[PDB]
Design an enzyme around this catalytic site. Structure first.
Site, PDB file in Angstrom:
ATOM      1  N   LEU A 122      35.601 -68.351  29.788  1.00 59.58           N
ATOM      2  CA  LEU A 122      35.233 -67.443  30.377  1.00 59.58           C
ATOM      3  C   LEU A 122      36.274 -66.563  29.976  1.00 59.58           C
ATOM      4  O   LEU A 122      36.916 -65.496  30.543  1.00 59.58           O
ATOM      5  CB  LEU A 122      35.265 -67.184  32.045  1.00 59.58           C
ATOM      6  N   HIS A 126      36.835 -61.815  29.543  1.00 62.75           N
ATOM      7  CA  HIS A 126      36.455 -60.986  30.709  1.00 62.75           C
ATOM      8  C   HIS A 126      38.465 -61.132  31.286  1.00 62.75           C
ATOM      9  O   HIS A 126      39.126 -62.300  32.438  1.00 62.75           O
ATOM     10  CB  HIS A 126      35.787 -62.099  32.115  1.00 62.75           C
TER      11      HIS A 126
END
Length: 165
Positions: A122, A126
């Protein structure tokens, strides 16, 4: 000077479970840090009281931030529909880290989650800044009631929401 903290009073099946505090790096990420706590403060007037975590997944993270519809949609930031990521100075170092979820680049809008495990897959896309100062044992509890489908076996709501320091 100080790192603003916010918390949620999580209640399961109509009764309280506990509270979780978070440390936000305002200096490192003024844009996300102010927006993140801004929703809790309800300065604009969202005032989401009793909002239930929009989506929770086990062995991954607890996703939330949607207060207007509680369906992963309708969420909005104080600035507008979406805001840009300040930077990736702080990454998914470990569990308990709070990150701003999005549907794509520069589309943060209103959405954040509390990770329970390190997510390297991730990171790099992000924006993330935050950690659980205390109450992780509660976050894990919420995770226990989470499911693969994202639905919760029990009912998790915010008894009260405010600005902690």
């Amino acid at each position: 000077m100080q790192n603003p903290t916010v918390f949620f009073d999580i209640a399961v099946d109509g009764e309280p479970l506990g509270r979780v505090s978070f440390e936000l790096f305002a200096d490192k990420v003024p844009k996300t840090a102010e927006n993140f706590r801004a929703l809790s403060t309800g300065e604009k007037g969202f005032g989401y009281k009793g909002s239930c975590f929009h989506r929770i997944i086990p062995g991954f993270m607890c996703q939330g931030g949607d207060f207007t519809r509680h369906n992963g949609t309708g969420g909005k930031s104080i600035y507008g529909e979406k805001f840009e990521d300040e930077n990736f100075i702080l990454k998914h170092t470990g569990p308990g880290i709070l990150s701003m979820a999005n549907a794509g680049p520069n589309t943060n809008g209103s959405q954040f989650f509390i990770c329970t495990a390190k997510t390297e897959w991730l990171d790099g896309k992000h924006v993330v800044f935050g950690k659980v100062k205390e109450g992780m044992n509660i976050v894990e509890a919420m995770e226990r009631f989470g499911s693969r489908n994202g639905k919760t076996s029990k009912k998790i709501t915010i008894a009260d929401c405010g600005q902690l320091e």
